[PDB]
Amino acid sequence: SDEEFKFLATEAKMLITAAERLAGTDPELQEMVALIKKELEQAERTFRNGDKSEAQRQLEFVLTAARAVMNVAAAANAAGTDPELIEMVLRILKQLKEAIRTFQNGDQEEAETQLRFVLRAAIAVAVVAAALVLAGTDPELQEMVKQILEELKQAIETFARGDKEKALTQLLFVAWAAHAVAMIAAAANLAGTDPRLQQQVKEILEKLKEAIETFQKGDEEQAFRQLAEVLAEAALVALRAALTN
Amino acid sequence: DEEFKFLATEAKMLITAAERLAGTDPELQEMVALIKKELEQAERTFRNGDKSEAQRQLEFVLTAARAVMNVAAAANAAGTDPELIEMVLRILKQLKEAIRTFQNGDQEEAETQLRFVLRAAIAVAVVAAALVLAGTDPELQEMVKQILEELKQAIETFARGDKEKALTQLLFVAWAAHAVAMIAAAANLAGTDPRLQQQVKEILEKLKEAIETFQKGDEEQAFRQLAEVLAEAALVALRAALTN
């Protein structure tokens, strides 16, 4: 599709420009962005003279990577000097560069699989990092982000051991749970002195603690249902607090 | 299959959160229940039929669930604003046609329709969020409702068959409404801080220029300026949040 290709490359170039600005002076980040910008050029040349279908796959792959380096650049900014998050970023960066190298050397299905995981991990570390920021000085919210980060550490080691689906599922849990923490920390600031809104936020927070613990206990169907509900309720209460003033 | 179980797990969460965000709205609940139905059939076909058809059917359901989650979010954030309500119902309508196209059989046309609907669903939710973060700011509310007009232009361009021009326009809508949201959140976090306020003002002026350039038809340059603005809005929203 010649007009669809132009559209996907437009998005890829936006993500790449933004990632490069977000990456600032970080060498690993700048290197990944530069590597991916070069890969977009290779998809465009392939489009300009070669096989449109090969360019399309090349380009769809560049798009996933650019999404991932965008998320990793955001995490690295938000994380500042937190050593655990910096260790995570560096690991995701390592995996993404290996994804690209594997893709360049022609085994595209195995690198596309790797890239899927990298993107989820990059989304996970970005919302964890943003949740740390929003939790501010609140120890209960910090303690929860600390657990959720540890679950993220486990997912990467789990993937390296070959249980891809379990690790991916664990990234999915990590992304939603740290997103709820962000929402809940936002809600408790948007509620102020209002005692109804504070109580409503506390109850939801208790539902997150329950869902995190169910997941750690291994009943995943129930824990995922609780998390999805928490997210909707945290959203609804954050919206309601925003509107009372 | 390992991928299929993880895909149904993601679709389930999106469907579960969309039900709660639907509340008692019947049009949104109709949409949720309808996508939940297709998820079950997908899982019934993986259970008692061909697994290859179930996974193409599940990947469609999963995009539908992301879309319906976005629109239900947007419907909540719209409150009683008549432009946004109207946009939401228009995307709900388009989403229903897409599902109905897939349920009949033209799966490739369902998928290209659904790809578009998911973008409009994303764009209308960020407009909605940005309108809330805009609060009582008249400058920001103008821009947001400006961006929503761009959004309405896209849906009709697409309904006329110029599919890729319209996709480019939603893309612009989403990054621009997103940038407004970031600038608004950063202004709220900065309080009265002299420098942070000046820095937010600078970014707003570059966002208006990007919008202006896009309206002139210089897409390549507007996309560059917008991608730049979004990174700069984000860095400044972080330094502000790291203050208060």
Numbering used by the authors:
A (entry chain B): 0 to 244
B (entry chain A): 1 to 244
Article excerpt on this structure:
To investigate the photophysics of special pairs independently of the complexities of native photosynthetic proteins, and as a first step toward creating synthetic photosystems for new energy conversion technologies, we designed C2-symmetric proteins that hold two chlorophyll molecules in closely juxtaposed arrangements. For Chl dimer protein scaffolds, we chose hyperstable C2-symmetric repeat protein dimers containing symmetric pockets with tunable sizes and geometries. In this dimeric repeat protein architecture, the hydrophobic core is independent of the small molecule-binding site, enabling full customization for binding with little impact on the overall protein structure. We describe de novo-designed proteins that hold Chl dimers in precisely defined, closely juxtaposed geometries.
SP2 was intended to assemble a ZnPPaM dimer with a conformation substantially different from that of native special pairs to investigate the effect of dimer geometry. The SP2 crystal structure was solved in both the apo state and the ZnPPaM-bound state to 2.4 and 2.5 Å resolution, respectively. The apo- and holo-state amino acid backbones both agree with the SP2 design model to within 1.4 Å r.m.s.d. The holo-state crystal structure has two copies of the SP2 dimer in the asymmetric unit; alignment of the two ZnPPaM dimers shows that their binding geometries are equivalent, with an r.m.s.d of 0.22 Å over the tetrapyrrole rings. Despite the accuracy of the protein backbone design, the crystal structure shows that the ZnPPaM molecules are rotated and translated relative to the design model (3.5 Å r.m.s.d. across tetrapyrrole ring atoms). Compared with the apo-state crystal structure, the SP2 binding cavity widens by ~1.6 Å in the presence of ZnPPaM; this expansion provides the extra volume needed for the ZnPPaM molecules to adopt their unexpected conformation. While the ZnPPaM dimer in SP2 differs from the design model, the crystal structure nevertheless satisfies the objective of creating a non-native dimer geometry. Using the SP2−ZnPPaM dimer crystal structure, we calculated an excitonic coupling energy of 241 cm−1. The experimental SP2−ZnPPaM absorption features at 668 and 690 nm correspond to a Qy peak splitting of 477 cm−1 (a coupling of 239 cm−1), which is consistent with the calculated value. The close agreement between the calculated and experimental data supports the conclusion that the SP2−ZnPPaM dimer system exhibits excitonic delocalization.
